[PDB]
């Protein structure tokens, strides 16, 4: 049987399709309890944030417009903080501090959202970065849902 816990998690996220794809990518999904799904989901979210940090660095490295560069630098600082916060989220989950887990996953989520908010009006955000922000948000939401299901 599919992990019954997946039926409680994915429908509560903002992107259930992505949630399913992410959780089903675990070969050992069925053996995982809520904590196990949590650690897996933090790992996925942090890896995405780390990749996007490199995407932003690459976009910056080809930019000369000062306003655009300032937007990328803001995105970069936010992703750096998001990576740090997700790192700490793992320890909080291990310790059973689900309140701190929610707060730190919420902060990580908002790193991507702050990048998004920084691109209001021209110069417009690159599609690549817009998609990467929405992805971190979707992935962090898996973590948030699990943090609320944990006792």
């Amino acid at each position: 049987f599919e992990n019954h816990l997946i039926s409680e998690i994915c429908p509560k996220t903002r992107n259930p399709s992505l949630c399913l794809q992410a959780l089903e990518s675990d070969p050992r999904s069925a053996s995982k309890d809520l904590k196990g799904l949590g650690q897996f989901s933090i790992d996925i979210a942090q890896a995405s944030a780390k990749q996007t940090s490199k995407i932003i660095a690459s976009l910056t490295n080809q930019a000369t417009d000062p306003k655009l560069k300032g937007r990328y630098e803001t995105c970069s600082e936010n992703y750096a903080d998001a990576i740090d916060s997700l790192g700490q989220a793992k320890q909080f989950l291990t310790s059973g501090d689900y309140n701190s887990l929610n707060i730190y996953a919420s902060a990580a989520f908002d790193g991507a959202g702050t990048c998004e908010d920084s691109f209001e009006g021209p110069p417009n955000i690159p599609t690549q970065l817009h998609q990467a922000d929405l992805k971190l948000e979707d992935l962090c939401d898996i973590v948030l849902v699990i943090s609320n299901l944990l006792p």
């Binding site: 936010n78 707060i103 920084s118 939401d141 943090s147």
Partner: protein
Amino acid sequence: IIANAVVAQDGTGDYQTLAEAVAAAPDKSKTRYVIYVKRGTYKENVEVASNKMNLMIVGDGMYATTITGSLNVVDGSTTFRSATLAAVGQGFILQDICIQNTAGPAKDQAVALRVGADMSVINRCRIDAYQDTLYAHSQRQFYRDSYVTGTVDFIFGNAAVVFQKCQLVARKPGKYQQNMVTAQGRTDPNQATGTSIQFCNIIASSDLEPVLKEFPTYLGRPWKEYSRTVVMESYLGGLINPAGWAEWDGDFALKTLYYGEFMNNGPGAGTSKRVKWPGYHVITDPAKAMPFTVAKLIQGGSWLRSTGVAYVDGLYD
């Protein structure tokens, strides 16, 4: 306790600028490290990074020590990077000091203080700007005995944050502007964030008081879809519009936001002409106010007690 590093303009300290003292502070300190900033106005943009943990920046008094800057959106800064002082280092404490952004209303978003530091305390501070004065960005934050002043969205972001015994002072904005004390930016209902204002004074500055009818002030507007703000056991001046809260963009968020008022007093506290949004709630049941206390919203005791700051844990003064 004596300071570990002193900042002063007259050469009597360890450093001439705050930025230098922060850079020389230890990384990942397991105890509170104190930077004392002597009286003066320090024209710098300071950042307290994630590695600068358990840092206390304390001045000579909220009127006597000022950190000032003027970065702003009109001149090409992002809101996030416009802050005069920005802090994300866990356990940050700011005390007896003014953080200001002097850009003014015509420069649009121009942040005085940005905080994204978990278990941070802002005690006896004066935070002074116009639009977007205080970016309580993320993580758990406690503001106590402080003065925060601004115009449009002057407390904004998505921290889990409690303001207690603060004076939240709306000032005279630019022509045709409307003041908003809060613009809470919770995007997602799974996030345990929101803004709670408790035992505060929400009042007008001397320059706004004569012109209340020209420049309205609302408690908040929903920057994001699940905006969540509660104002309780507070004094509300006559500056507060009868509607109480304002639209962001037509009917955006009006069913999904959660805006609450519990046991407020003063000439602006009447709720009979408030908005009728599904998301707006006159709270009479204390159990529905309890989630917004220091104990529940920011798990405050687990970390506030070691700071020395005063706090009320529950609902009543």
